Amino acid sequence: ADQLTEEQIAEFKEAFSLFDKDGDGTITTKELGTVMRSLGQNPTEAELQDMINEVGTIDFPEFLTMMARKMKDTDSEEEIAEAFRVFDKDGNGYISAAELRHVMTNLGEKLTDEEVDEMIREGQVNYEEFVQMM
Amino acid sequence: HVKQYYFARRGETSTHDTSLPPPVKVLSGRSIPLKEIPFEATRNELVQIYLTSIDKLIKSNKLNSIPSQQIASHYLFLRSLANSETDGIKKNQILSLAKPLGTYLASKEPHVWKMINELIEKSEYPIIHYLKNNRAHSNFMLALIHEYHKEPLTKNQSAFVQKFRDSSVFLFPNPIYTAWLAHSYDEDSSFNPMFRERLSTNFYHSTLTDNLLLRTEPKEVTLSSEHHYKKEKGPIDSSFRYQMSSDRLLRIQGRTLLFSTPQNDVVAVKVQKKGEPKSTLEEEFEMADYLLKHQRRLDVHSKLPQPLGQYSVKKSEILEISRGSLDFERFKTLIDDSKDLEVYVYKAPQSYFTYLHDKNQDLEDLTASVKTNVHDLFVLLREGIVFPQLADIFHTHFEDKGRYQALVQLLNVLQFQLGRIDKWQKAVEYVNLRSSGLADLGDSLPITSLFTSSDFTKHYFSELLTGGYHPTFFDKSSGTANSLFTGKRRLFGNYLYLNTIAEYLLVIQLTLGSYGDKVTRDMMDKPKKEAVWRELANVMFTSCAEAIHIMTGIPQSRALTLLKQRANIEKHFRQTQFWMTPDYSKLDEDTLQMEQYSIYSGEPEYEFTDKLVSGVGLSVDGVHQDLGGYNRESPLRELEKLLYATVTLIEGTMQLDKEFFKQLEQVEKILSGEIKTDANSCFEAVAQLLDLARPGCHFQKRLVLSYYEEAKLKYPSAPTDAYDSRFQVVARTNAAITIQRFWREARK
Ligand SMILES: Nc1ncnc2c1ncn2[C@@H]1O[C@H](COP(=O)(O)O)[C@@H](O)[C@H]1O
Ligand SMILES: [Ca+2]
Ligand SMILES: [Ca+2]
Ligand SMILES: [Ca+2]
Numbered sequence: 001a002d003q004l005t006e007e008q009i010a011e012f013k014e015a016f017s018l019f020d021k022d023g024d025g026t027i028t029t030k031e032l033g034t035v036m037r038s039l040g041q042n043p044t045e046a047e048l049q050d051m052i053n054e055v056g057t058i059d060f061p062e063f064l065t066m067m068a069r070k071m072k073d074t075d076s077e078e079e080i081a082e083a084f085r086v087f088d089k090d091g092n093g094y095i096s097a098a099e100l101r102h103v104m105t106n107l108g109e110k111l112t113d114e115e116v117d118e119m120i121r122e123g124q125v126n127y128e129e130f131v132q133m134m
Numbered sequence: 135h136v137k138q139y140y141f142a143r144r145g146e147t148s149t150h151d152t153s154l155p156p157p158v159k160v161l162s163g164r165s166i167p168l169k170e171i172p173f174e175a176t177r178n179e180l181v182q183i184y185l186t187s188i189d190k191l192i193k194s195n196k197l198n199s200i201p202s203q204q205i206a207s208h209y210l211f212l213r214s215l216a217n218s219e220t221d222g223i224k225k226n227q228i229l230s231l232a233k234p235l236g237t238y239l240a241s242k243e244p245h246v247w248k249m250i251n252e253l254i255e256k257s258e259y260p261i262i263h264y265l266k267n268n269r270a271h272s273n274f275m276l277a278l279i280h281e282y283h284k285e286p287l288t289k290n291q292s293a294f295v296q297k298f299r300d301s302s303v304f305l306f307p308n309p310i311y312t313a314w315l316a317h318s319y320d321e322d323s324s325f326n327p328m329f330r331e332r333l334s335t336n337f338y339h340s341t342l343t344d345n346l347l348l349r350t351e352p353k354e355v356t357l358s359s360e361h362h363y364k365k366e367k368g369p370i371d372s373s374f375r376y377q378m379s380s381d382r383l384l385r386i387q388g389r390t391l392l393f394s395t396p397q398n399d400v401v402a403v404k405v406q407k408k409g410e411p412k413s414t415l416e417e418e419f420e421m422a423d424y425l426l427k428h429q430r431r432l433d434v435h436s437k438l439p440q441p442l443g444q445y446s447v448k449k450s451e452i453l454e455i456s457r458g459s460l461d462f463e464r465f466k467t468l469i470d471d472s473k474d475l476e477v478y479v480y481k482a483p484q485s486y487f488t489y490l491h492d493k494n495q496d497l498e499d500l501t502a503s504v505k506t507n508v509h510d511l512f513v514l515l516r517e518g519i520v521f522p523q524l525a526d527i528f529h530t531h532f533e534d535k536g537r538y539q540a541l542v543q544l545l546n547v548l549q550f551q552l553g554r555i556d557k558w559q560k561a562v563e564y565v566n567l568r569s570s571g572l573a574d575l576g577d578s579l580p581i582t583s584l585f586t587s588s589d590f591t592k593h594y595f596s597e598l599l600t601g602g603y604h605p606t607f608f609d610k611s612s613g614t615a616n617s618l619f620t621g622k623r624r625l626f627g628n629y630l631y632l633n634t635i636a637e638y639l640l641v642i643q644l645t646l647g648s649y650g651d652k653v654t655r656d657m658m659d660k661p662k663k664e665a666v667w668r669e670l671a672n673v674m675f676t677s678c679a680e681a682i683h684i685m686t687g688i689p690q691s692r693a694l695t696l697l698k699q700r701a702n703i704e705k706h707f708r709q710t711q712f713w714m715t716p717d718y719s720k721l722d723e724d725t726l727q728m729e730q731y732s733i734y735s736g737e738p739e740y741e742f743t744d745k746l747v748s749g750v751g752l753s754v755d756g757v758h759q760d761l762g763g764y765n766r767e768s769p770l771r772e773l774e775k776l777l778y779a780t781v782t783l784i785e786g787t788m789q790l791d792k793e794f795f796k797q798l799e800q801v802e803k804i805l806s807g808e809i810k811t812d813a814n815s816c817f818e819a820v821a822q823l824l825d826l827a828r829p830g831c832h833f834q835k836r837l838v839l840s841y842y843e844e845a846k847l848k849y850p851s852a853p854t855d856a857y858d859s860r861f862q863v864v865a866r867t868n869a870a871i872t873i874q875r876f877w878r879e880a881r882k
Pocket of ligand 1: 529530531536537538539540542549550551552553554765766767768
């Protein structure tokens with residue numbers, strides 16, 4: 001079901017634990033939409049309603065496979081393009097390379113120096129092209 | 135699948151104060167009633183007095199005469215309190231008072247006013263970011279009450295101030311305290327609950343935990359109908375009898391006879407002790423079986439023993455089998471005196487009969503084993519199962535031999551540090567933590583027995599269940615002994631819970647220490663010894679982080695980082711290595727003082743008037759080493775700090791998550807329309823959610839950002855100047871994380 005990264009599983013684990021209000025290692029459907037929203041995957045009415053029908057409680061392995069199914073729907077192409085966009089104050093599609101070091105390495109799951117150097121390869125470098133590469 | 139989940143659900147209740155000893159103390163056969171000084175009512179009376187005193191500060195035009203860092207503390211505290219206040223009239227009283235301080239700082243100390251406004255655009259409770267260093271030690275709130283409030287404090291108020299004079303933090307209302315405490319462990323925090331006053335040094339880690347716990351609600355755990363301690367079972371079936379051959383008897387361990395099998399595992403016949411009832415053996419059978427059945431459900435890592443029977447055997451037969459082996463006489467004395475003895479028969483790997491401190495394990499296998507033991511202890515704790523006799527740890531004041539209390543300061547009146555451990559290495563000699571994982575599973579308690587007046591709590595913790603007496607507590611007017619302590623009757627279960635968490639990790643520490651002493655005693659190589667003790671420190675820190683992970687869900691890497699903010703691993707390794715080996719017993723006074731300076735690095739050296747035993751060290755009995763002198767504290771200061779750090783992160787976080795969801799529920803009600811309100815106080819409720827998120831946790835912040843957007847759609851007609859920078863910072867991070875996950879996949 002799940003080809004997820006170490007980091008995704010760390011995140012979904014803490015999130016599951018937090019919204020497991022009684023510590024029995026299962027969440028109710030009450031919480032499911034709110035927890036889903038917390039992980040960037042706010043569901044439609046129907047998708048949330050479909051998940052609710054499938055059922056009371058949901059353990060953590062069942063969660064790691066609901067999440068993968070919703071993740072398949074996501075266009076990588078768009079979800080990555082809308083992220084880079086934040087760093088584009090203007091509509092130029094241009095960001096700075098001296099900078100993008102000081103972003104990737106100072107925020108989130110921070111990149112290592114080797115990873116930052118490896119990225120700068122692929123004065124300035126534009127984002128709209130970079131997504132087309134992958 | 136096999137469903138993963140616990141047979142226990144945790145909730146809340148009105149009080150733990152049901153069926154408890156009367157709150158009374160008997161002195162010269164006179165009955166003295168013990169009264170509780172309410173924590174919340176008294177805290178609040180003092181914040182009112184603080185606000186009056188600010189009022190009086192303003193009216194004296196003496197702002198000029200208090201230092202700047204204090205005026206900041208006052209201003210920032212009053213902004214944070216105003217933000218926590220839902221009454222508009224009081225909210226407004228509080229900002230009237232802030233405003234003259236703000237007028238002043240702007241005009242006369244403006245590098246400082248600029249530092250303030252930075253914190254104000256990050257937070258609704260900016261005081262907690264201000265007090266992340268040495269500033270927390272300056273009690274600006276008590277200092278000012280002392281200057282401007284010209285009445286004696288009440289008895290209650292005075293008692294409160296006596297207990298929490300260390301920091302103004304202790305006066306903060308619940309959501310501001312909880313949020314300070316959690317963020318105090320963060321990567322940009324340098325706070326340490328330690329301060330040098332005069333030449334003396336004041337350690338106040340325990341007080342962070344008491345201030346926190348006195349704010350909490352009484353917990354309650356409900357075990358399913360299916361729980362081990364609930365489901366009604368029938369008698370045990372024992373349709374098979376193991377035929378004992380002296381030919382297959384490997385050796386005698388304690389009262390258990392060990393026999394080999396064709397499969398290279400072991401059949402154990404555990405024989406009944408003098409005065410041991412049949413039921414003790416029965417419960418070990420029943421608990422081995424339950425854990426074997428639910429093993430997959432619980433992700434139990436231990437290699438569990440497999441139960442085979444519980445039945446009566448002739449002593450003539452037990453004697454006829456054992457006769458040859460070494461230990462025959464000790465076993466003969468150990469076992470009951472009766473013609474018919476009950477046995478419990480089970481099968482187990484060889485690794486089960488290996489004690490977790492065994493010097494034949496190398497560090498890799500020991501680490502693997504410790505991790506298994508630690509995992510199962512906390513996973514089983516979540517399931518509702520407690521093991522109260524993993525080891526035989528005792529204290530002694532002079533002679534009273536008492537069960538060791540890992541958080542002794544929380545559970546009694548006016549005890550300041552962990553007491554000396556008697557014959558420490560012996561206490562774990564026969565620890566029920568094995569190379570395979572857990573053992574001696576029948577010696578176990580339902581977690582509910584910690585939240586009520588069980589035979590156990592009434593026995594080991596009756597000061598905590600009765601109330602606090604001490605002569606300084608006695609009022610002559612009301613005829614009663616008043617204390618903060620007597621208030622713990624309502625929350626006593628929450629205290630025993632945390633105690634249990636520290637106690638598990640204390641046993642792990644003693645087991646690690648025994649292994650280290652045994653492995654390094656004959657080492658010739660002084661850097662190689664030091665290596666072992668550095669690694670045992672890493673295992674101890676890591677275990678504490680595993681416990682955080684399992685109880686809270688904080689990733690272990692973040693938990694290890696939070697711990698190291700508070701507990702120093704260089705010092706822990708140095709202290710353990712010094713006091714858990716006999717080498718200090720050979721040092722002269724000057725060398726001993728020089729060595730002590732290194733292991734405590736500027737903190738006060740351990741003081742003792744005891745005479746050291748050559749080749750042993752501190753030892754009351756002339757033969758076994760102790761941790762501490764006669765009537766003195768344990769010298770493992772850092773261990774104490776680490777056990778308190780661990781237990782404060784777990785409770786700290788549960789209680790932070792509670793504050794969050796109470797705010798969330800308020801934001802969802804506003805957003806949906808179930809509470810009509812103005813724009814600006816919708817934004818305010820959302821910004822507040824930001825503050826209550828766990829430190830280092832992104833996914834909460836993300837949810838709040840989502841709430842924020844939702845709100846701007848609802849009230850588009852309203853500026854966002856006060857809130858834009860913080861939300862943009864959350865947004866940049868959310869965007870950067872997606873870019874990072876994208877790049878990680880590309881490398882593959
Ligand atoms: N049951 C206990 N478990 C752990 N430490 C204790 C216990 N009782 C007292 N202590 C501590 O041991 C030291 C000496 O004992 P006492 O003279 O009873 O205070 C003090 O520093 C106490 O805080
Ligand atoms: Ca649940
Ligand atoms: Ca045992
Ligand atoms: Ca036992």
